[PDB]
Each structure stands twice: as structure tokens, then as C-alpha cells.
């Protein structure tokens with residue numbers, strides 16, 4: 095992948111394949127993400143359907159089509175404003191102790207002789223934490239990890255990131271069943287003037303959408319630190335913060351995102367018609383030499399690091415403070431807990447947008 099990025103960055107940073115457009119350079123990627131008025135996120139007809147959702151003309155639909163993720167201002171701002179305080183670093187700092195108790199308790203369950211740290215650490219941690227934040231009880235651990243696995247690029251349902259079917263209907267059942275027992279954020283949404291369909295989409299989004307991505311951040315960090323042999327240095331020079339950011343830049347859990355043009359617009363030398371999809375390659379932009387010196391090297395204390403792995407502009411990941419925090423703690427406790435790590439086996443997440451590991455088998459010595 096990355097060498098193709100490197101080539102496209104040289105020869106067409108903005109590229110039409112006869113179907114859609116694809117952007118590879120940092121400058122044009124950031125331009126696209128921030129120009130919400132020409133590059134829309136409304137890929138699921140949320141705005142056009144909003145009124146009929148609220149007045150009940152629309153009786154049945156896929157709840158996760160209608161969230162802040164697939165909306166433009168003002169609807170987007172109004173939706174996000176309901177939970178932005180909760181996911182701020184100031185408000186999350188309360189959780190540090192809980193996140194840390196949880197982490198070390200998850201480290202305990204690990205067999206240093208041989209274990210899968212995706213299964214033991216990286217998967218359960220984001221799930222335990224978001225459950226705590228939302229007041230939504232992990233009743234069945236297996237259901238929750240299965241629900242988390244529904245999150246995927248969907249060709250070609252362009253706004254959609256949830257696989258449907260019986261497991262999805264189970265998730266809807268679960269959420270209807272716990273609406274009223276939730277923490278205050280859930281109460282905000284439940285008591286709002288949103289349609290029930292939107293209420294479901296909103297909760298499901300917060301509950302589930304961030305699990306695998308955060309899990310991937312943790313896994314990719316473990317991989318990158320091990321391969322490039324930085325564990326000691328990170329621990330000794332205390333580089334956690336900047337290292338995690340370099341992980342995010344180098345191994346982004348979300349490889350790319352997409353927009354649709356609201357009007358004919360100009361990007362670089364190219365002219366993009368209206369109604370065209372524009373795929374924006376975060377992973378490629380994160381290695382643009384114009385912005386990142388030695389962009390193909392992993393510098394654990396890289397600075398500056400204005401990477402795009404949480405996006406840019408009004409859609410800048412709501413979970414970024416949370417993901418950074420969980421990851422920071424996970425790594426810290428991990429690097430303190432073990433001295434030696436060898437990688438026995440890996441199985442990658444196999445699809446196109448999500449970038450991480452289904453299995454990461456290690457041998458660690460105990461400390």
C-alpha cells in the first residue's frame with residue numbers, strides 16, 4: 095500500500111479512475127476535510143430525510159445511517175453538541191484511575207508463555223470503558239465483541255459502516271432495552287427531540303463504533319514499538335505521548351474517509367464535478383514529505399506531528415481524547431509490566447478501511 099501512496103503522491107495526488115476521485119497528498123486531504131460546505135458528509139440522505147424522521151412519515155430505516163458522522167452543519171453541530179463535553183479531555187481525566195485498574199486487571203489474565211494480546215487486552219479494554227462511560231452494562235461479553243465486529247466499510251452503501259443482519263437487530267434490541275438505565279449522555283439523547291431512529295443511531299454510534307478502531311490503535315502500537323525496537327527508549331525517555339501519536343500517524347486505524355461534492359469544485363489542477371465521491375487517503379497524507387520529514391521513518395518523538403488519523407475540521411473524531419487516553423494507559427502499563435517481547439504470529443484485519451490485527455500472539459517475560 096504505502097509505496098503506491100508514495101507513487102500517487104508524486105504523479106497524481108488527486109486522481110480520477112473513471113468512477114470516483116482519490117486524494118493522496120496532505121494539502122488536498124486536509125483541504126477536503128475542512129471544506130464541509132463543498133465536500134459533504136451527508137451520504138445517507140440524512141438532511142433530506144430529517145423532517146420525515148421527526149414527524150414520523152418515515153417509520154422504518156437503518157438507525158446508523160442517521161448520525162453526526164453522516165451530516166453537515168447545522169444538523170451535525172446540533173447532534174454533536176449533545177455529547178461533546180463528555181468526550182473532552184477535561185471531563186475524561188476523571189476516568190484515568192478506572193482505565194488503569196481495568197488495564198492492569200486485563201494484563202493479569204495474560205499468559206506470558208504465549209498469549210493473544212488482541213483477545214486479552216486490546217479488544218476488551220475499549221469495550222469495558224465505553225460501557226462505563228455510557229452506563230450500558232456488558233451483559234454478554236461475546237455479543238459485545240460481535241457487535242463491535244459489525245463495524246466495516248460497506249461497498250457500495252457509501253455512508254454506511256455497519257453490517258446488518260440478525261446480530262445488528264440484536265444490538266438494536268439491546269439498546270432499546272437499556273435506554274432508560276444509561277448515564278447522563280444517554281439521557282440527553284433519549285430526552286431530545288430526535289426521532290427514535292436517530293436516538294438508536296446515536297447511542298449505537300457511541301457504544302460500538304469506536305471499539306475496533308481503538309483496539310487497532312493499541313495493537314498497532316505494540317507492533318510498531320516491537321518491530322522498530324523502541325520499547326526501552328520510549329520507556330526511558332518517557333515518549334508515550336509522542337510515540338502514540340507517531341503510531342497514529344504511521345499506522346492509522348482508519349485508512350481513509352470519503353465525501354460527496356455539493357457543487358463543481360477545484361482541487362489542485364483537477365476539476366471535480368458535483369455529486370462525485372471523493373476518497374481521501376488519510377494514511378497517505380500522513381506520510382507526505384512536504385509535512386513530515388523522513389515521512390517513511392517511525393520517529394518515536396516526532397515533532398511536529400499534525401497527522402490526520404482522527405480527521406480534520408468539524409468531524410474531527412469525537413473519541414480522539416478517549417482513544418489517546420486508553421492507548422496511553424494501555425501502553426504505559428504494558429511497557430512497565432513486561433521487559434521482553436517476541437512476536438510469534440499475526441493475523442491482520444483483512445479489509446480496506448480498518449487497519450489492525452485480529453490476532454497478535456506474543457511471548458513476554460514476566461517482570
Ligand SMILES: Clc1ccc(-c2cnc[nH]2)cc1
Nearest residue numbers: 246247255303304307348447
Ligand atoms: Cl469503516 C469505519 C470508519 C470509521 C470508523 C470510526 C471512526 N471513529 C470511530 N469509528 C469506523 C469504521
